[PDB]
PDB file of C-alpha atoms in Angstrom:
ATOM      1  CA  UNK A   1      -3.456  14.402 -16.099  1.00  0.00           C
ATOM      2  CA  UNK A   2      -0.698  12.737 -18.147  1.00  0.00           C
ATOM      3  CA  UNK A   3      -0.453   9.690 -16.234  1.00  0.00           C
ATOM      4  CA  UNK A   4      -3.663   8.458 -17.325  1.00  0.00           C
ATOM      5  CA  UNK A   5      -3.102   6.162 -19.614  1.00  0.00           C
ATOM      6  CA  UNK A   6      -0.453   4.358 -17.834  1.00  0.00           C
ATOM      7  CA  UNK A   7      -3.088   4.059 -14.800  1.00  0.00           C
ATOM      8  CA  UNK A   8      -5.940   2.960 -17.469  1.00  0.00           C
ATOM      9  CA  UNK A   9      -3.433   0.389 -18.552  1.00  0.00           C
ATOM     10  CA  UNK A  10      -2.558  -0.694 -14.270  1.00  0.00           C
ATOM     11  CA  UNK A  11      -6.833  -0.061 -14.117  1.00  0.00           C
ATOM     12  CA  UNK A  12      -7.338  -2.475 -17.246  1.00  0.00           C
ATOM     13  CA  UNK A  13      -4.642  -5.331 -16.293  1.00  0.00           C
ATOM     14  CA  UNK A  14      -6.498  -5.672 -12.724  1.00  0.00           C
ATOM     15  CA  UNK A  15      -9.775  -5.640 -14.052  1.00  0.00           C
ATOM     16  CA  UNK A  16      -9.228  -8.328 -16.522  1.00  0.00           C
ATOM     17  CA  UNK A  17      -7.325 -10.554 -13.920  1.00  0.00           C
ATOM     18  CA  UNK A  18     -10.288  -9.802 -11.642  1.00  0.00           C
ATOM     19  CA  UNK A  19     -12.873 -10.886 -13.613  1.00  0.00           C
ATOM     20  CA  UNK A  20     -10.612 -14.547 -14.952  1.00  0.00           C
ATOM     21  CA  UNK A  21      -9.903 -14.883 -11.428  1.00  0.00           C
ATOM     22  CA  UNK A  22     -13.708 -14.911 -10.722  1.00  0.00           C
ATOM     23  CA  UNK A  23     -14.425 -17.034 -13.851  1.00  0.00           C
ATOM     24  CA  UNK A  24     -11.624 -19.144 -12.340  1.00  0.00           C
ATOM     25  CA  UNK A  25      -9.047 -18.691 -14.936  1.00  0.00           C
ATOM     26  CA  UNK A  26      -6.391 -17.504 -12.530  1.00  0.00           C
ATOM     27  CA  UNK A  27      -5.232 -18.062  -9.059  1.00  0.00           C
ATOM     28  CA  UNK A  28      -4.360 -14.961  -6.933  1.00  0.00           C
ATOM     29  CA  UNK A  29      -1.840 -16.783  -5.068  1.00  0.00           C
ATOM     30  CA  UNK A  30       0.544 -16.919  -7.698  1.00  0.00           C
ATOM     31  CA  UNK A  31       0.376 -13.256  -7.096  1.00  0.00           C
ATOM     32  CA  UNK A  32       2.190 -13.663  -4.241  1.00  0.00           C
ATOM     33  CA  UNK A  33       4.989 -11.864  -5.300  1.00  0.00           C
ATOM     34  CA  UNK A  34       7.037 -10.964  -8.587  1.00  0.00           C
ATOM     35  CA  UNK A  35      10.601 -11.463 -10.555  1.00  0.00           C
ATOM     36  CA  UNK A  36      12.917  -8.707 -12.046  1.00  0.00           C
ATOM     37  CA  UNK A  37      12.115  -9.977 -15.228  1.00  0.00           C
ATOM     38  CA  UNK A  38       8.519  -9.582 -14.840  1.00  0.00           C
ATOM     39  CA  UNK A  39       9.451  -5.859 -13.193  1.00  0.00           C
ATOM     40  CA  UNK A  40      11.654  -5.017 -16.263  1.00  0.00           C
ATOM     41  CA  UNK A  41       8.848  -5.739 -18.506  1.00  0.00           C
ATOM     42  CA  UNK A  42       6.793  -3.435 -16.957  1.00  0.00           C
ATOM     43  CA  UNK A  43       8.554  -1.129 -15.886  1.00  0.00           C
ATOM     44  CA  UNK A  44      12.035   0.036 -19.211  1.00  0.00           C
ATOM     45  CA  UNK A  45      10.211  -2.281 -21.708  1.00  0.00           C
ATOM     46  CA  UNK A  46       7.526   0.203 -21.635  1.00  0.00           C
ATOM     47  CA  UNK A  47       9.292   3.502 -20.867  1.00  0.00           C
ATOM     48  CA  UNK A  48      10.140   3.729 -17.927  1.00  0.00           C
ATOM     49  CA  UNK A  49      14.044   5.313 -17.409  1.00  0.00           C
ATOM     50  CA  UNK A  50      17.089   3.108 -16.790  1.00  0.00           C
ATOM     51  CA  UNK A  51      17.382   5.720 -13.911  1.00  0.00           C
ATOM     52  CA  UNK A  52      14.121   5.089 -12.441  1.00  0.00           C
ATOM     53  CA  UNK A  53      13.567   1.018 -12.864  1.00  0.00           C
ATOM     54  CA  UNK A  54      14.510   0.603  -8.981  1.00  0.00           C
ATOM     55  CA  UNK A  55      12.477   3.327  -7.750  1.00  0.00           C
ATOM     56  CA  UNK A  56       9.396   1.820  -9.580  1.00  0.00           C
ATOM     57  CA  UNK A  57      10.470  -1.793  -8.585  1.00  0.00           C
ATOM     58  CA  UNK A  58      10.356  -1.116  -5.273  1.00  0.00           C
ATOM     59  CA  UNK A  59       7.146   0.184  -5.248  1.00  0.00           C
ATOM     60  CA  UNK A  60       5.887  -2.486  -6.879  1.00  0.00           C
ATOM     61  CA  UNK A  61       7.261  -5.351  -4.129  1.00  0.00           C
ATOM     62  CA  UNK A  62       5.966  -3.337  -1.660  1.00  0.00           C
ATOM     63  CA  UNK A  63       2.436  -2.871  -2.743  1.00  0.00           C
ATOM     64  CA  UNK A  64       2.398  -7.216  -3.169  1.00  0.00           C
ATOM     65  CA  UNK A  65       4.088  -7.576   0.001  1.00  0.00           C
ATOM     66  CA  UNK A  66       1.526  -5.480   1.256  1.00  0.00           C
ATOM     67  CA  UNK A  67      -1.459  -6.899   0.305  1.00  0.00           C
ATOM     68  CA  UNK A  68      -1.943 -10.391   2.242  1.00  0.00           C
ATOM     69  CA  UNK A  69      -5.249 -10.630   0.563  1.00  0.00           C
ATOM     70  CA  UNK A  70      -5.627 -13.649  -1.344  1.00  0.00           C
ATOM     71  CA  UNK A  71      -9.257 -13.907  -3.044  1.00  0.00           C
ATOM     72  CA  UNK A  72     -10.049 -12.201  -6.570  1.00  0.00           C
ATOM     73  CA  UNK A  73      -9.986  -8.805  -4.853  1.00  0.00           C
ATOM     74  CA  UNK A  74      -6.590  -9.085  -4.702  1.00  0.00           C
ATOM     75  CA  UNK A  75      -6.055  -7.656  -7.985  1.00  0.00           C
ATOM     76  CA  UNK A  76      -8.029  -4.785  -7.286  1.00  0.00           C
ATOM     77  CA  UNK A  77      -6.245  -4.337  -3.864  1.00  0.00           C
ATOM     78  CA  UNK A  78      -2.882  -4.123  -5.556  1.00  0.00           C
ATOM     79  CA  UNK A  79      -3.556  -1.693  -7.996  1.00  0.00           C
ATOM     80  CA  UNK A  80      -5.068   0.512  -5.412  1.00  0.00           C
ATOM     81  CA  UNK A  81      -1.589   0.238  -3.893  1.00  0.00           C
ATOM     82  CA  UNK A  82      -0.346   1.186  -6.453  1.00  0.00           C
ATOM     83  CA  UNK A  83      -2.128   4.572  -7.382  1.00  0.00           C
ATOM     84  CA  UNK A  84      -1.766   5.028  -3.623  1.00  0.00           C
ATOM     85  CA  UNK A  85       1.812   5.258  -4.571  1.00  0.00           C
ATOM     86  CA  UNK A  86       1.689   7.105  -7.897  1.00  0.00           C
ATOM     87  CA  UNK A  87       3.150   4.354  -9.662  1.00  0.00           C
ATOM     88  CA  UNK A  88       2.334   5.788 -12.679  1.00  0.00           C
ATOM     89  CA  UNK A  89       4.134   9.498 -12.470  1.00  0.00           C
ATOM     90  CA  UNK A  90       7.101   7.148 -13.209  1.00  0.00           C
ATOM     91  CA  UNK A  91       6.124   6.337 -16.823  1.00  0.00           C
ATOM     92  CA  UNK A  92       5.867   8.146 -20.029  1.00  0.00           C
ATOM     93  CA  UNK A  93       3.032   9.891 -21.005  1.00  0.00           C
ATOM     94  CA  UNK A  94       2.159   8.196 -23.797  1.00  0.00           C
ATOM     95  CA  UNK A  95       2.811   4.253 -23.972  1.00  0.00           C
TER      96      UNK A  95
END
């Protein structure tokens, strides 16, 4: 499909996060939730349309709300939200 190199990119980011927060490089409670900056970064920094940003952004603050998990699996947990959601059928095909 052509969303799968955003999801790679989603697939990568929680991978790596996963395995620092297992070497204990990072700590998933800061994960807690998320700003607009961080949300514009990821969302019309990389593609996504003016139009859309909100639609995406709430999306994404759902999916964190959602997920009260708090050990390393919550950056696996998140992501799943996220394809659960098709996050990525908001973004550009190639990025």
């Amino acid at each position: 499909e052509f969303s799968e190199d955003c999801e790679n990119i989603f697939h990568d980011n929680a991978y790596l996060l996963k395995l620092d927060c297992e070497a204990g490089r990072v700590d998933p409670v800061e994960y807690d939730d998320i700003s607009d900056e961080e949300i514009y970064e990821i969302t019309v920094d990389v593609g996504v349309s003016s139009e859309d940003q909100e639609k995406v952004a709430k999306i994404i603050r759902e999916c964190i709300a959602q997920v009260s998990t708090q050990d390393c699996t919550k950056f696996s947990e998140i992501y799943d939200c996220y394809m659960k959601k098709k996050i990525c059928n908001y973004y550009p095909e190639n990025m």
